[model samples]
Target chain A: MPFEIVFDGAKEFADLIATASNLIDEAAFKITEEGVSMRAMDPSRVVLIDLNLPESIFSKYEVEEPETIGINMDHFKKILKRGKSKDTLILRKGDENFLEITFEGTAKRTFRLPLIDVEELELELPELPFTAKVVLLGEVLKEAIKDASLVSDSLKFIAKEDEFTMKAEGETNEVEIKLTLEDEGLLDLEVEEETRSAYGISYLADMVKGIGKADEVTLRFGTEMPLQMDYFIRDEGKLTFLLAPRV
Target chain B: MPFEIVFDGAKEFADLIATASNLIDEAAFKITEEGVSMRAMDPSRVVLIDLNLPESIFSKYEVEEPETIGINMDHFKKILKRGKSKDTLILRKGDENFLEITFEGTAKRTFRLPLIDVEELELELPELPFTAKVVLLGEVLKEAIKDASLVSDSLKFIAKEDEFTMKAEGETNEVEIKLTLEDEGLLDLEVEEETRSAYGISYLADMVKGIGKADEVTLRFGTEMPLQMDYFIRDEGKLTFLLAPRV
Candidate 1:
């Protein structure tokens, strides 16, 4: 069955897919009457991403029947790049194997991408017992990650009773950014117990590249547990990333 | 003799040297009571850049005697990178071999670069019998150069009776932009005779990277003659670049 959706937040959708593309090369999009959802894990199995956009996010959404389509993220990203930040985005499924993406602004630009066969993998979302959680301004973490990247390939994140700390160390240089619970940038902090973990910097940096789209990011993790980052896209949707700790 | 100068346009000066560093590796700056001037030719001798600033451009200018200092543009660019757009830039001659560059804002950061001995070549400015001249908004030409760069390594620029044209041809694609004399973006134009010339796309692109700093740029050239670009910087200084035509 054919389906179509139109939304004015082309930039938000583009940012969502760009962040997803950085983690996985291919994704299977499941579209239902409720909305659309995608879940994928990188080949190395170090990172996983789940994105959800409810029907309310779309100005106009129509579907005859629920369907799943596989997409090459690289090609999808290139098409989305054509959209301006304020342009309207239209996605339509015409033939079984093709999807049409269009950006409507002063001029309308459309691109057709051929859907590729993707390996059907049942990726069971893991249940982690996170003991510590923190909600902080996205820009604060984004800046700290950038500063940490200058010193090391791994970043150590610690959540304690009164503060959250991100630290990185190199042969001769080290950087540490500490944010107290009362800091203006820290929205909330809950600690069952103090927990700390380390993750690869590059993957974390790529995951946070879209932080600009969201005002705040909720971080959850425990000792030696996979880190989870959740971004609420206004009142419409949410994007989440799970990165395994570097053991 | 020693010299010192201070100003608030760190971003503009940073952009200037960044563009200059793209074409030339080293430059000799002649500082006098009148101001400072730098004229240098790239190693290939295909491109020449002449930058001038009057004493009025600086908030504070002091020179005990006229002196010439050689600078490694890469090092100078790195120093300038520490400055923000609103920060004040302070340039001071410390020792005979070192130049101290400092940025004053909420924080003060300083960098010292060692001046290397360079051959004081007499760079006699060339006099080209330009047969045509046109004045247009820098952004208009900047966009054309970028669009042309996507298709070819060189861009062809033409000025005629009532319009200016920039064109580039590739193996399978071609792009051209034409601006009439009455276009809102075209400020002025004068043509003694129709003239056209082609220049390396990369060189011209690098030379105009700072076009955002100025509102308009004056272009002068002739058939098979070198291209000259003059940028007036906010009534305080001027930057001129001359590029030899590519046969």
Candidate 2:
């Protein structure tokens, strides 16, 4: 059976896949009666990304039987590059071994990307006992990570009862960004106990690129535990990333 | 004697200096009762940039005596980074060898860049026998150069009786952009004879970064001759660049 899906929100969808491509080169998208989802990890096995798009998000979603479509993310992103923020996107899979991507805007453009074989590993999502959680505007986190990247390769994340802090120190330079509960962008804070962890700044920077599309992101972590960043796509879907600590 | 100048076009002025810095690392700025001007060539000596700001453009322009201020373009650009497009810019030199730069926005930010010694060489503007000239929207030229940059390192510019064209060829890719007299942005065209020249795409790309600030740029060239790009900053001043042909 063939599979096809047509949807608007080109920018939003493209942004989601671009975020995924930053960590992994390829991904296998599972199309079922429920919707489409992908789970992939970086080659180094340090960061993992999980993406979900329910059938309701698409204007027209049809699937005769369940099938998995392997995509080279770089090619997929190139096609998405032709689309504007408000453009419509269509995905179709027929007898060919390639996925057809069409962007409808001032002009209609179509791109076909050859599908490849993807690993069929059942990824078990980790259940971390998070002792600290914070929900804040994505821009705040993005900016802090950017500042940290300028100073060092690793950034320390500290979540206290009253504040969240990101700090980086190089041989001669240091940068620190602190946000308190009183800050306007910080929506919420929950801490069973104070927690601090250090992670590679590069992966954290990549994880937050697509979070800007969402107003806020929920961050969960504990001492030396994996960091979890989740962004809700309106009410339609969620994009989540988990990164292990450098140590 | 001390010098101080206050102006409101921080963003505009910063963009001008940033544009010049892209071509030259250091420049000697002459401040006179009339205005300020700088002319310098890049280290490679293949590109030259000339910048001018009239006294009338500043709300308050004062000079105790005609003096030349030697500036390291990188340090100057760093100070300009603090300025917003609509923010006011204040430059002062008082009891110090460094120039003090201040940006007045919601909050006042200040940076002091040390002065440097620069040779006062009399720049002899070239007298190229340019056979063709055209005035068109700066963005059109900028976009064409950007597209060509993707294909090759050298771009060919052709000017004929009816159209102006830019073309680039790579081992496997070629791109061309043509503008006829009927194009809305092609303001003016004059040709004594058909003219064509090839220029390094890197220099041309850097030359047009700030040209977008102006509505139009005047381009002049001849067979294997240098290319001249002139951008008028509204009624305030003019920024000009000359790039030696690739050969």
Candidate 3:
């Protein structure tokens, strides 16, 4: 049986894979009658990414039967990026072990991505009673991570009653940025109790690099526990990245 | 004594170095009372680049005396690229062995590039009587060369009474594109006699990659003779690239 789906939000669709491309290289996408889902962890098992794009987000989605579409996320991202932001992208199962993707605009641009065999795997995501959660514009969080990268490869994130701060320090260099509720960019700041944690800057940077400024990034974590970054895509799909705290 | 000049057409100024950066790694710029000029041959001696920008192109040009600014073109291009197209660029002689460059827009950004010790050498340019010449949009010429590269590393350029064509062929594939005076993009065609020549597509591609469509590319060549590409900048400066025909 053949399955197909059409995405009017082509760029937003690419953004999903682009973010996943950072942590995982390959994954088996389960296309069920409902929609598509992929759950995988990074090589070290310290970071996990789970993406779910429901059929509701697609203009046209049809799945005659459930199928597994194994793909190289990086290569898939490249093909998805070829289509313009406003262009329509059609993803259809191709002949034998291939995925056919076509972009519709002034001209029809099509590409065939070879499917790979990925082993069946399952991962667990822990739900912690996080003491702090900050919802802010993705762009601000993106810049603060970049700023932290200037000093060290890892950064410590702290959330107080009404403010959030990220700081990184090396032998001679240091970088820190803070955002408060009064900030026009900060959407919300809720802290049952002050909490702080440390994570690798490199991984966090990749997770937020392609995030849109207007989109919200919900940051939730506990003191020295794993950090979860939820990048809400198109206000409908949520791409979650989890990274464990580092020393 | 310090020599300082400001360019209102900052992007156009960057375009000049960007073209030269592809062929030459470093060169000595002669900034005299009249203008700035740099003439250098590529490492292989197969191509030569000659650039001349008169004082008229600069909004502010001041020279106490003739100064030789030895610079690495690749590094200079990076700094030039930091300025926006509309921002004014200030290039002044900095403290020992440094060139001070600043971009003025909503915010002032400054960068210092170290001056290198480029050898003092002068190469003579041969003036050939090309039998054919064609003027067309830079963007069109750029695309033709790119099309040629898709097939082979080199390409053949043909010029007739009123038509110009570029073709590249390999054992397995071939590519070609043609333009006539009737084409809206073709600006002019003047041929004393029909001529055809072959040149390395890699060099040709680099020479015209950043050219704007509105700008003009004057191409002159003779059968089995060297090819000359004239990319006019800002309608005031002319950057010429000469490449020997390849077998």
Candidate 4:
């Protein structure tokens, strides 16, 4: 069977996917009639990433049937790395329950990963009415997580009308960084209400790790809601991540 | 006074110096009749990083008098970052009490940093006739650190006859890696005797952070001795680091 996912900018999407994986363990991916949706799960939380790729993002693509695929995290990650920069990637299930990955690069590189049967939880994520939304200039949040991670394992995020906050507390000290809508450092921000939530610093660190290579990340969140992160990947497509709440 | 100090590669040396600063807060660099010696203090711990710039590495250079310079960490780092490709950086001190940084790029970008006088530290540094000098390939150790850092924040290095070991431990897991003298990874290793030592992960992490940008780094150690790391700045020059023991 030939299975192909056509993305205009494979490199960007690949990089964003790789970054989200670094934040959480297993990612739940679903293909609907419209586009692709993914959710990432860490220990006590989940993150939902949704990318609506209209016909514009792909010139040739046909999925006769929508597939809800939950892959073994490591195996899926390995395929993504191999598919990096390939412009086009094709993933298919072959005989002996093998998942075949083909990269259309200068020279085709094919890799096969043995798929193991896994019982993935049927996660029905609830809809969160996010009170605040901030388009964090990717590099700023990325650096804050990195700097705060040096001192703590968890970072608390506070979002309010016209403001966003990231704070971390260590043994004897605390680092609290606040960005207001009026702040020059902050970009597009929409806040209907205020909310505060804490995330594993490791995951946040991973989510923003690739910022130096990319331009920006759109952060959609509310207190106690699964965080939705969107990266405008390579201006070709969007890499979206939805992480469940920690709490 | 007009004085010129020429390093074969400004970027390489500056990067190395910046990396070395991460190990300690302040580095006291002294230019003497020999070459240059740097001593740094980290709480109760101290590391002596000495660089003997032989006549070969230095072009025509003259100083009216030997200088003991106490460089502010942040200012020094900013100046280093401004260095351009193959730029021969000139540091000039004048009666006006400002340290001038002259970068010879396409356009001469000169910036002056205010100098601060620091208290003189007096200590007799012992010259260790290291019984065992192992010259391991730089990339090998750098790779090992990247892997080991994934698991823990400290690494244990063991060197026995014909073999070297790097081990990292976390809360519930550990990563133990071994490289034999016969392996290509062990570029040039000399073992006068068996030895082992533990070093902070952050020190090694910073030391090798730029290894991805460089070709190799040479790691040298003795039993309980400070880890001595050296990297070829270029074909004609080298940058060396001496990190004190963690515990």
Candidate 5:
């Protein structure tokens, strides 16, 4: 069936594609009757991005059958970057070869992107019980990643009963970011037991970098397990990344 | 004589050096008893930047004999960019060998730049009786140049009896930016008759790109002579560029 989907904010949708482009080169959007979902791993296969956008999230997403549309993540991101914050975005399947991307603002701008042959894969999301979960503003994590990245390629995240601490070390330089309930940036902290894990700096930065400063990010991790980050879009969508801990 | 000059703000001084670095590589700062001045031409020899800062511009300037300080503009700018907007800047001849650039905020941060053997040259400012002079905000000119730069390598500026216009064209695309009295961006305009001149986009972009958005630029040009721009700093300094018209 031909598909046409409209999003309320153009910049917001662009941000999602930007975050995805950093890891996945090609992605296949599986649009079902309920919503749209895309699960893909990075080129190195060390991290996976699972995007879930319910029909309720779209400004106009009509009921759809099981549709799989392949797209080049980088190419799609380039078109979206031209959109302004106030513009509305639309995705349409025009003809069988080209996907039509349109932005509505003072002027109605449209771009045609060729449909790519993205290899279809059925990747299952790993389910793990996370003992420590911390929810904080995206800016907080973003700042910590930026500071830590300067000194080390990998950073460790430690969640204690009362505080969440991130640390990175180098031969001479080191950086630390700690947050507790008293900090305005820390929204929620739940800890069954103390847990710590180390992940590549590049992986963590890309996950939360595209999100807005005020956007909430729920982080879940346990000792020596994959780190999970759920970047909640304002209302009904979530961009989740599962990054394997660095050895 | 060892020179020590203290500036009111660090970021503002950084911007001046940044704009200069875009055109000139190494420059000699002539610190005279009255003030500090620098004049150098771009590598192409088509554009010349003449910077003048009176003693009044500095927060603390102990009057002294004439001294010349040669510096690599690009290296100096890197250190200054790290400074905050409110940080006080001090330039000191810490030793006979190095220049001490310090920023004073909550903490005093200092950086020593080794003295470079720069072959200083003298350049004279061209004396031109400009018929049409327009003083407008830097953001307005910056935006116009950015839009025009997209279509072609060169853009033209035309000053009519009552209006000023800028336009650039390519094989398929063209851009125009016009400001009239009705537009808030148009601050002041004076046209003895009518004058129009075309200059390279790169030269014009580099001229005003580094200054603050609210900074004022007084543009002067006659019929195909040269484009003269005087970017005025907030208080007691001015960065000026003279660019030759494209043949």
Candidate 6:
């Protein structure tokens, strides 16, 4: 079985995801009786993403049989790149769990990605109430993280009522970025809880580097739990990442 | 003195040049009097790239002088990228040959790049009797170069009356690709003489990576003179590269 959609949306997102070097399992999908929709849960089962397809986004599509095929996410992402320019895309599952993604437009191109077997694993997502949430623009956080990464391998994130801060210290240099909830640049804020979490600045930076301005990233965490980032990119797609706290 | 263009399509080209790792001073640029055309010549003075910009591509622009200003091509390219997705891009020339590039969108961002002092040297393009001209699919040559580069640092290009060949040899592997004059993939071939020239594989790979499918690459060559490649892309524009032959 194969799932497909026609996305005439942001190309940068697809491009960024393709270049990411990672190995994750993905299942072969197809449009069901209701319509075309694809959903997945991380191997750890801690993070899940569901995508619903409406009839409006497709030019022509069909599906046969419900399929739960495993594929290497990184490899599949690389194949997704071939569809970067197509306004309408179609995907079909061939034999042996091999999936084909087609890009149709001025030129028609198709990419085939071989599925791989992944061990089933369980991931427990710890729930800790966040004391504060300050929505800094993605680009703002990107710059701050880059600057902070240059100073230290890890950054301490502190969220209190009305303020969110990122601080890192190096051998001789230190970087600190603070955003107040009242700043006009702040899109939204909720401070029912206060929390401080130290995260690997490098991993977080690499995870968010692909995010664009229009993309909204919700950074949620508490003391000792993995940092959960949900990237809300309207129309294009969604990307969620969770980084386990360093021991 | 300052020149600004809200939108100019030089960002990608500049980024490519920056990745070439040439020192800022080694990378030289020539902006035409109209500020609508530019050319970047390599440090060795053997490889040159001519890039043209038509007035239609600029949303808003202003140039005070018609002088051919010489600047570090890499720094200039980085500044241009600040406007990656910006609708309005402003370039300001400040004291001591410094340049400030500003990207104006929903949020204003600016990057300052220091201009390196580089003397504009007169280019003496050798007038070689290029007895052979081959118009072929760039993808074919691009793929061949990639395959060759994997095995060797340089590739020997042999062109005869009936065939054009590329061969590369390494410690353990040797690869060769030939295109017949009659091959449909070969557009046109005119050989007044048979010649074989060797060039560095990496340089040739970088120069032709962006060639579009419909675009035909004109390889004008002689036994020893630098290879001249002329690429005609869609309305996006033309890119001409000249690389000195390797012994």
- In candidate 1, position A235 carries an lDDT of 63
Give per-residue CA lDDT, model 3, range A1-247, as digits (tens).
3888999967767877887988888888999888888889888878888888888888999887678888888768876766567668889885567787766542244456678888757776678888999898888888888888889999998999978888999999998888898897688889999899999988888788777777888999999888988976566777898888998
Clash pairs for candidate 1: none
Per-residue lDDT for A19-96 in model 4, tens only?
656655565556555656665455554444344454355545555566666556654664555444534665554334
Binned by DockQ into CAPRI classes (incorrect, acceptable, medium, high), candidate 1 is incorrect
Error (Å) of candidate 1 at residue B9 is 3.3
lDDT of 5: 0.83
Using all chains and alpha carbons, the TM-scores for the candidates as numbered come to: 0.55, 0.56, 0.56, 0.51, 0.55, 0.51
| TM value for model 1 | 0.55
Candidate 1 Cα misplacement greater than 4 A, ranges: A1-247
lDDT of 3 by residue, B1-247 (tens): 5898889957767877888988899998988999999988888888889998889888999988888889999899999988888899999994478999989988899999999988767676788989988888775677566545655799888888977877777754444556777765578888888899999988887788767756788989999999998976667788998999998
Model 6, span B1-247: residue lDDT tens: 6465556434543444453434224434444435454455665655777655554556665665443445566445544544444325655554445455555443344455555556655655457788788889877888889999889999998889999888999998999899996677788888888988899987887776656555678899889877988865335555667788997
TM-score of chain B of 1: 0.95
- Give one digit per residue, the lDDT tens place, for model 6 in A81-175: 65555335665665556667667677777777776654433433346554555555787667666756656798887777777777777764455
lDDT string for model 2 (A177-236, tens) is 666776655788898899999999989988887667336889999999899998877577
- Summarize candidate 4's per-residue lDDT along B129-202 as a digit string, tens digits: 56556665555566567656655788888877777778776754445556665555566667778888888887
On a 0 to 1 DockQ scale, where is model 1? 0.04
Clashing pairs in 6: A2-A29, A2-A30, A3-A29, A44-A123, A131-A193, A131-A194
Can you give the lDDT of residue B236 in candidate 1?
A: 68
Question: What is the Cα root-mean-square deviation between model 5 and the actual structure?
Answer: 9.3
Interface RMSD against the true structure, candidate 3: 8.3
> Chain A structural similarity (TM-score) per candidate?
0.95, 0.94, 0.94, 0.75, 0.95, 0.77
In candidate 6 the C-alpha lDDT for residue B146 amounts to 90
